[PDB]
Write a protein that binds this DNA or RNA. Sequence first.
RNA 1: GUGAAAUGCGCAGAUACCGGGAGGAACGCCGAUGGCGAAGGCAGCCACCUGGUCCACCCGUGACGCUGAGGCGCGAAAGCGUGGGGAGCAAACCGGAUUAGAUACCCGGGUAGUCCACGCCCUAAACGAUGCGCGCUAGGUCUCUGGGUCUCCUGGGGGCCGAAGCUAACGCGUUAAGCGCGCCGCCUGGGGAGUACGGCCGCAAGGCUGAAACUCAAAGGAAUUGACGGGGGCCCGCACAAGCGGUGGAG
RNA 2: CGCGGGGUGGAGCAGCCUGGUAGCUCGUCGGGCUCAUAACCCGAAGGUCGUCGGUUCAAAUCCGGCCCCCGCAACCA
Lengths: 155, 114, 70
Amino acid sequence: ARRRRAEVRQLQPDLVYGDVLVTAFINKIMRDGKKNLAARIFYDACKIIQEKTGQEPLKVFKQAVENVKPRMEVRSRRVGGANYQVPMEVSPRRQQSLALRWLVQAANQRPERRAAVRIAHELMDAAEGKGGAVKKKEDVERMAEANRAYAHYRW
Amino acid sequence: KRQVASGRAYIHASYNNTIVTITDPDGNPITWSSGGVIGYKGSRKGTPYAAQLAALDAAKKAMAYGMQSVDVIVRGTGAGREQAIRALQASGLQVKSIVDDTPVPHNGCRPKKK
Amino acid sequence: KAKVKATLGEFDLRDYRNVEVLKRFLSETGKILPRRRTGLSAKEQRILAKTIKRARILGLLPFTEKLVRK
RNA sequence: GUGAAAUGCGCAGAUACCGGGAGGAACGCCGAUGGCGAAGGCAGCCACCUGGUCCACCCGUGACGCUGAGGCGCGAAAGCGUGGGGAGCAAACCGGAUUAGAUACCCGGGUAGUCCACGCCCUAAACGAUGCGCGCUAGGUCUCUGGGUCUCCUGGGGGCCGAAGCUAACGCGUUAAGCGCGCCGCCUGGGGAGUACGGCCGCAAGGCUGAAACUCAAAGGAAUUGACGGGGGCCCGCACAAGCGGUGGAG
RNA sequence: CGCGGGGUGGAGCAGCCUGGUAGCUCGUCGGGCUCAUAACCCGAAGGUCGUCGGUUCAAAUCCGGCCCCCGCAACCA
Ligand SMILES: [Mg+2]
Ligand SMILES: [Mg+2]
Ligand SMILES: [Mg+2]
Ligand SMILES: [Mg+2]
Ligand SMILES: [Mg+2]
Ligand SMILES: [Mg+2]
Ligand SMILES: [Mg+2]
Ligand SMILES: [Mg+2]
Ligand SMILES: [Mg+2]
Ligand SMILES: [Mg+2]
Ligand SMILES: [Mg+2]
Ligand SMILES: [Mg+2]
Ligand SMILES: [Mg+2]
Ligand SMILES: [Mg+2]
Ligand SMILES: [Mg+2]
Ligand SMILES: [Mg+2]
Ligand SMILES: [Mg+2]
Ligand SMILES: [Mg+2]
Ligand SMILES: [Mg+2]
Ligand SMILES: [Mg+2]
Ligand SMILES: [Mg+2]
Ligand SMILES: [Mg+2]
Ligand SMILES: [Mg+2]
Ligand SMILES: [Mg+2]
Ligand SMILES: [Mg+2]
Ligand SMILES: [Mg+2]
Ligand SMILES: [Mg+2]
Ligand SMILES: [Mg+2]
Ligand SMILES: [Mg+2]
Ligand SMILES: [Mg+2]
Ligand SMILES: [Mg+2]
Ligand SMILES: [Mg+2]
Ligand SMILES: [Mg+2]
Ligand SMILES: [Mg+2]
Ligand SMILES: [Mg+2]
Ligand SMILES: [Mg+2]
Ligand SMILES: [Mg+2]
Ligand SMILES: [Mg+2]
Ligand SMILES: [Mg+2]
Ligand SMILES: [Mg+2]
Ligand SMILES: [Mg+2]
Ligand SMILES: [Mg+2]
Ligand SMILES: [Mg+2]
Ligand SMILES: [Mg+2]
Ligand SMILES: [Mg+2]
Ligand SMILES: [Mg+2]
Ligand SMILES: [Mg+2]
Ligand SMILES: [Mg+2]
Ligand SMILES: [Mg+2]
Ligand SMILES: [Mg+2]
Ligand SMILES: [Mg+2]
Ligand SMILES: [Mg+2]
Ligand SMILES: [Mg+2]
Ligand SMILES: [Mg+2]
Ligand SMILES: [Mg+2]
Ligand SMILES: [Mg+2]
Ligand SMILES: [Mg+2]
Ligand SMILES: [Mg+2]
Ligand SMILES: [Mg+2]
Ligand SMILES: [Mg+2]
Ligand SMILES: [Mg+2]
Ligand SMILES: [Mg+2]
Ligand SMILES: [Mg+2]
Ligand SMILES: [Mg+2]
Ligand SMILES: [Mg+2]
Ligand SMILES: [Mg+2]
Ligand SMILES: [Mg+2]
Ligand SMILES: [Mg+2]
Ligand SMILES: [Mg+2]
Ligand SMILES: [Mg+2]
Ligand SMILES: [Mg+2]
Ligand SMILES: [Mg+2]
Ligand SMILES: [Mg+2]
Ligand SMILES: [Mg+2]
Ligand SMILES: [Mg+2]
Ligand SMILES: [Mg+2]
Ligand SMILES: [Mg+2]
Ligand SMILES: [Mg+2]
Ligand SMILES: [Mg+2]
Ligand SMILES: [Mg+2]
Ligand SMILES: [Mg+2]
Ligand SMILES: [Mg+2]
Ligand SMILES: [Mg+2]
Ligand SMILES: [Mg+2]
Ligand SMILES: [Mg+2]
Ligand SMILES: [Mg+2]
Ligand SMILES: [Mg+2]
Ligand SMILES: [Mg+2]
Ligand SMILES: [Mg+2]
Ligand SMILES: [Mg+2]
Ligand SMILES: [Mg+2]
Ligand SMILES: [Mg+2]
Ligand SMILES: [Mg+2]
Ligand SMILES: [Mg+2]
Ligand SMILES: [Mg+2]
Ligand SMILES: [Mg+2]
Ligand SMILES: [Mg+2]
Ligand SMILES: [Mg+2]
Ligand SMILES: [Mg+2]
Ligand SMILES: [Mg+2]
Ligand SMILES: [Mg+2]
Ligand SMILES: [Mg+2]
Ligand SMILES: [Mg+2]
Ligand SMILES: [Mg+2]
Ligand SMILES: [Mg+2]
Ligand SMILES: [Mg+2]
Ligand SMILES: [Mg+2]
Ligand SMILES: [Mg+2]
Ligand SMILES: [Mg+2]
Ligand SMILES: [Mg+2]
Ligand SMILES: [Mg+2]
Ligand SMILES: [Mg+2]
Ligand SMILES: [Mg+2]
Ligand SMILES: [Mg+2]
Ligand SMILES: [Mg+2]
Ligand SMILES: [Mg+2]
Ligand SMILES: [Mg+2]
Ligand SMILES: [Mg+2]
Ligand SMILES: [Mg+2]
């Protein structure tokens, strides 16, 4: 990215909810270009969301993903010869991409057999503010403050 | 010494730490704090954030003795001088007047190897 | 801004006692003010410096004023 | 305290703050592209003693001038002798760290010394690396300091730019490395060597004078081009970063 | 022989005071940063707080006996 700045790739909305967020989230589930399988596993969980709670999977997804949005992180700025781990803002772009990634990463971490059953639970506990995906969030935020001293390097 | 509303705070800005001593308007200290008192060790005691917490903490302690008004006095140059000050007035403590009293010889003692 | 020379009227600058005159030259902190802002020339700037020092010794003038409010 | 630390210091009360006191050393701002001195060098303030220098008046002597082997005096720092002084700093020294080692660079300690008196020492990148004196050869600008009714004129210094000219070039150029004369000092390939011997000096450390054998076919100055840098500036590549998937493991 | 105060996580230790807190340090594991190495940071697993009884709503904390260690002082025909 030494030249321009790179265009944040655009994305066709959901073939269902019409949500771009869901479109992206699917890609994270997607294994080896098999997009079909990914969507399937997602929607299967989507309905499972209601099967458990009288709530629709819509806001369950937003509520969840919004609780896994890390407010601030630690970037290692190697200035002054040494590599200081400075705490600073998370670009709105990152908060999303990271959340979704952690979401699915923590989801795969779950033990249960079927994959869609993991995306469901992880999604629920996430909106509930309790999931293991949230645990990575609570960490990165604390890891940021455990070094608030060097924050005077915030570029 | 024990109970007075007016007083004075002393900033001391080293390059490896920052301390602050709040005293009565005579000179005698009431309490104090520093980067180390705050929790940090070594370089981080020099950090401006530490200095921020020092003044804050030193303020809270003085608050209890009934301190409300203080003329600030600063000596040093360390990355935290103004941050201690900024953290002081922002501590709801009355900053009557900031002053600079950093000592400097009219050429006398030979410095270190530096 | 304002040259210190013109800022004042006619005056003797070997007088180490008219503190009111001298005091005007002596910076915000008692530092003998730079020639490049006292409006003084070479020879006069010198005689001034010497008389100030004299005054400070008599106690009339300061050696150092603390920098107030910063 | 540092890159981060450690040694170190601190509840036997340190650091930070206030008051009283002791002692040594060095002089902030003015301060500079500044000033003085033959050089080494000389910086708070006061008084005394003293050297050099510059300007005006056109007054006095009447060539009394220049240089100057040897001699004599001066001569930063370190170092030495006797006595005194000792805050800070600090070779040596001890510890901590770093590292393969670290007899160092960094840190915590620390002695002689650095300060004064008297007396030695006499060297230096004691450098403008440019001996002193005199006369002559465009100017522009900057500044320090004298004299004169004074958008200036006229002496004495301190920088820069540059005529002619010089120079191997770099560069110098009325503050010459230009054009000339007087006088002194010095050089004659690199290494051996500022060594050896002899002499003279020194308390000592050491200083002054100062070779040869042998050996080398170069040592050397300035400038050109490029390459290189744990140099800088601008700019770029799946170079790092961000992200996805892998070999290194198993067959 | 009597007197004094100690046992708490893998190691050292605060908490005992005066009842409602088991903490810190390094160590071990994962993660973050790293040329490397520590430093730093995040998280984590791990203690009937010696033993048996006792007062108490509740103690490792106050009580009694005892086990073991450390120390104090004395004696030794
Ligand atoms: Mg760019
Ligand atoms: Mg590095
Ligand atoms: Mg994005
Ligand atoms: Mg540190
Ligand atoms: Mg530091
Ligand atoms: Mg030192
Ligand atoms: Mg000034
Ligand atoms: Mg360490
Ligand atoms: Mg120490
Ligand atoms: Mg105590
Ligand atoms: Mg005092
Ligand atoms: Mg004192
Ligand atoms: Mg006293
Ligand atoms: Mg003394
Ligand atoms: Mg004194
Ligand atoms: Mg004395
Ligand atoms: Mg002196
Ligand atoms: Mg100066
Ligand atoms: Mg200037
Ligand atoms: Mg000079
Ligand atoms: Mg001198
Ligand atoms: Mg002298
Ligand atoms: Mg005399
Ligand atoms: Mg004189
Ligand atoms: Mg004279
Ligand atoms: Mg005549
Ligand atoms: Mg005549
Ligand atoms: Mg006359
Ligand atoms: Mg005659
Ligand atoms: Mg005549
Ligand atoms: Mg002559
Ligand atoms: Mg003669
Ligand atoms: Mg001769
Ligand atoms: Mg001679
Ligand atoms: Mg003599
Ligand atoms: Mg000297
Ligand atoms: Mg000496
Ligand atoms: Mg010496
Ligand atoms: Mg002797
Ligand atoms: Mg002596
Ligand atoms: Mg004395
Ligand atoms: Mg002595
Ligand atoms: Mg001393
Ligand atoms: Mg020292
Ligand atoms: Mg020793
Ligand atoms: Mg040791
Ligand atoms: Mg050593
Ligand atoms: Mg090495
Ligand atoms: Mg060895
Ligand atoms: Mg040694
Ligand atoms: Mg000593
Ligand atoms: Mg010796
Ligand atoms: Mg002296
Ligand atoms: Mg004396
Ligand atoms: Mg004396
Ligand atoms: Mg002698
Ligand atoms: Mg000498
Ligand atoms: Mg010589
Ligand atoms: Mg020189
Ligand atoms: Mg010459
Ligand atoms: Mg000459
Ligand atoms: Mg002219
Ligand atoms: Mg001009
Ligand atoms: Mg003039
Ligand atoms: Mg006239
Ligand atoms: Mg001169
Ligand atoms: Mg000069
Ligand atoms: Mg000129
Ligand atoms: Mg020419
Ligand atoms: Mg030429
Ligand atoms: Mg020139
Ligand atoms: Mg001319
Ligand atoms: Mg001329
Ligand atoms: Mg000229
Ligand atoms: Mg010639
Ligand atoms: Mg030969
Ligand atoms: Mg030779
Ligand atoms: Mg030869
Ligand atoms: Mg010689
Ligand atoms: Mg010799
Ligand atoms: Mg020699
Ligand atoms: Mg001989
Ligand atoms: Mg000899
Ligand atoms: Mg001789
Ligand atoms: Mg002799
Ligand atoms: Mg001699
Ligand atoms: Mg003799
Ligand atoms: Mg002797
Ligand atoms: Mg001796
Ligand atoms: Mg000899
Ligand atoms: Mg010969
Ligand atoms: Mg020869
Ligand atoms: Mg050849
Ligand atoms: Mg060359
Ligand atoms: Mg050329
Ligand atoms: Mg090259
Ligand atoms: Mg630069
Ligand atoms: Mg660039
Ligand atoms: Mg990468
Ligand atoms: Mg593999
Ligand atoms: Mg393979
Ligand atoms: Mg292979
Ligand atoms: Mg391999
Ligand atoms: Mg008995
Ligand atoms: Mg017995
Ligand atoms: Mg017994
Ligand atoms: Mg006892
Ligand atoms: Mg409990
Ligand atoms: Mg902790
Ligand atoms: Mg273990
Ligand atoms: Mg290690
Ligand atoms: Mg730590
Ligand atoms: Mg239990
Ligand atoms: Mg229990
Ligand atoms: Mg039990
Ligand atoms: Mg014992
Ligand atoms: Mg006892
Ligand atoms: Mg007995
Ligand atoms: Mg016995």
